[PDB]
């Protein structure tokens, strides 16, 4: 058998006691990235379907929580994400703005205006 976190980099870190200076509860290091799926090491306190944020300004949803790693799906091109990046928890499941402030506005899947008519009112949020 084999795990995806058994790569020699993680084992190297853990052999010489370098795994204590890294916060593996609210941050993680990307093990793999490809075809829009990142496999992240750490994030031990991350909830299923929670939104994490990569170092390069991208977002992602953590769908597969396995013993070794977390399978995050990236919200954009995986061009900007490289193995070894840093992924931080956002803390909250994905939610969107709501209200009459959206009427007449074109928005994308996450409630960001894309019609260039200015910010979106967004008094209330909803999961």
């Amino acid at each position: 058998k084999t795990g995806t976190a058994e790569v020699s980099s993680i084992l190297e870190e853990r052999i010489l006691g370098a795994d204590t200076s890294v916060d593996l509860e609210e941050t993680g290091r990307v093990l793999s990235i490809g075809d829009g799926i990142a496999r992240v090491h750490g994030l031990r306190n991350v909830q299923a379907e929670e939104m994490v944020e990569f170092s390069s300004g991208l977002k992602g949803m953590s769908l597969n929580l396995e013993p070794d790693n977390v399978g995050v799906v990236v919200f954009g091109n995986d061009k900007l994400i490289k193995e070894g990046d840093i992924v931080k928890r956002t803390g909250a499941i994905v939610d969107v703005p709501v209200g009459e402030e959206l009427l007449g506005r074109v928005v994308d899947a996450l409630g960001n205006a894309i019609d260039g008519k200015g910010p979106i009112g967004s008094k209330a949020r909803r999961r």
Binding site: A48, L63, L65, P67, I93
Partner: protein, 467 residues
């Protein structure tokens, strides 16, 4: 015992028990949950790890959450206090009328009665409905398939069966809705309240509903049939009576099983169903039987994918059915109710050794005359009514009278027909059809037979409308 969630892949949760593993099929409660989440164990992956199928949304779970081992499979509250109460698969009430107070709890994973706890003689369940009791009698403790299921009277027929069985034999009933639309679930709740099979005030209900919602994870829609079986098995064993168990829908039972099997990571069988399709169906259908104490008669609504009768789902369910009822849109058009297709309906116990020679002969004569009228209708359509003989116009008249007499007014439909419901015993039905076949009533008008109870009601109707 306490373990930790180690993995969460979709609706599958891998837990780790450092102290001691729970057996397969147990139920585990996730501690730290705003609403009760129950995980049913399905595998022992080794290294003290177990894999569980979740009965509710796993979103918001963390790797490390504590999980408490209940020690027994899903245990639901069974008893006489479940009658008239909706409750989901894990037994929690969902009708917001307070807790289901009972002194009994039953595990939903039980075993079929042993080979010696089995009635060796066939029986007949008298539902008080002419067409069902004549052309397709319902065996006691036998599965009945029910086809149609779209604006043809499936719900009214289900409700009438509930009422008759709770009135004739006094047994209660269970309505397990496997993958039930919430809109139709609420509509059914209210229809039952209106007709009276559920009573929110005086606690004289005759049905216990168990809803597996259509938006529950696949691991919940796969087990609600078992919760219904448990609620009915209490009444069979403990109360020692004959119960009815309506499973709507059974194709959704197979679909939920298939989805669970795929999620656990098993190779699909012939048409993409679970490799355990036959056993997954058999373990449930084998608990609907006639023990020496009571009996459970089940009524599966059945859906045939792609209209294919050889698809593994119906090909596997039909192996268990002991009868069949076919509601037809073409008969509700004629105003006949219940719109049961007299010729397409089938029964295994329509055998002279079981139902007796007289019942068998009457049923066969009615079927033959109805087939003759069906054949003659082509001649009527093409060559015109004039072409008939005098030994064929007579058969046409007799068949029309029989079609009218097979219709009946239901007690749970007095707000649709203006009449008063009739629960026709069996002897009355057999005598009425025997007399009509003999020709004793050839002088009456056809409409004197429409929507009446026993034959004497047809006589009275003829007198009242002719005079």
């Amino acid at each position: 015992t306490t373990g930790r969630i180690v993995a969460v892949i979709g609706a599958v949760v891998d837990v780790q028990f450092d102290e001691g593993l729970p057996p397969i099929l147990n139920a585990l409660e996730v501690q730290g949950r705003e609403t009760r989440l129950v995980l049913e164990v399905a595998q022992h992956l080794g290294e003290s790890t177990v894999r569980t199928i979740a009965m509710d949304g796993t979103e918001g779970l963390v790797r490390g959450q504590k999980v408490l081992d209940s020690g027994a499979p899903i245990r639901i509250p069974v008893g006489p206090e479940t009658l008239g109460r909706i409750m989901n698969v894990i037994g929690e009430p969902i009708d917001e009328r307070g807790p289901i107070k009972t002194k009994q709890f039953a595990a939903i994973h039980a075993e079929a009665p042993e080979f010696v706890e089995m009635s060796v003689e066939q029986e007949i369940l008298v539902t008080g409905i002419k067409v069902v009791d004549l052309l397709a009698p319902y065996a006691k403790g036998g599965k009945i398939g029910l086809f149609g299921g779209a604006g043809v009277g499936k719900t009214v027929l289900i409700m009438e069966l509930i009422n008759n069985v709770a009135k004739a034999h006094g047994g209660y009933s269970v309505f397990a809705g496997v993958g039930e639309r919430t809109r139709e679930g609420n509509d059914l709740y209210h229809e039952m309240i209106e007709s009276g099979v559920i009573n929110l005030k005086d606690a004289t209900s005759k049905v216990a509903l168990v809803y597996g919602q259509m938006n529950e994870p696949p691991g919940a829609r796969a087990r609600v049939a078992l919760t219904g079986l448990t609620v009915a098995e209490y009444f069979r064993d403990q109360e020692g009576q004959d119960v009815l168990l309506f499973i709507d829908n059974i194709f959704r039972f197979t679909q939920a099983g298939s989805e669970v099997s795929a999620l656990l990571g098993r190779i699909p069988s012939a048409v993409g169903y679970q490799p355990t399709l036959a056993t997954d169906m058999g373990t449930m259908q084998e608990r609907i039987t006639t023990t020496k104490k009571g009996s459970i008669t089940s009524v599966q609504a059945i859906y045939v994918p792609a209209d294919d009768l050889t698809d593994p789902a119906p090909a596997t369910t039909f192996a268990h059915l002991d009868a069949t009822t076919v509601l037809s849109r073409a008969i509700a058009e004629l105003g006949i109710y219940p719109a049961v297709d007299p010729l397409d309906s089938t029964s295994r116990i329509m055998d002279p050794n079981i139902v007796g020679s007289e019942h068998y002969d009457v049923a066969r004569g009615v079927q033959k005359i109805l087939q003759d009228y069906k054949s003659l209708q082509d001649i009527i359509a093409i060559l015109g009514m004039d072409e008939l003989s005098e030994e064929d116009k007579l058969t046409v008249s007799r068949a029309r009278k029989i079609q009218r007499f097979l219709s009946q007014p239901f007690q749970v439909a007095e707000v649709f027909t203006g009449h008063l419901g009739k629960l026709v015993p069996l002897k009355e039905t057999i005598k009425g059809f025997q007399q009509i076949l003999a020709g004793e009533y050839d002088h009456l008008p056809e409409q004197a037979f429409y929507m009446v109870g026993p034959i004497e009601e047809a006589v009275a109707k003829a007198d009242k409308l002719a005079e």
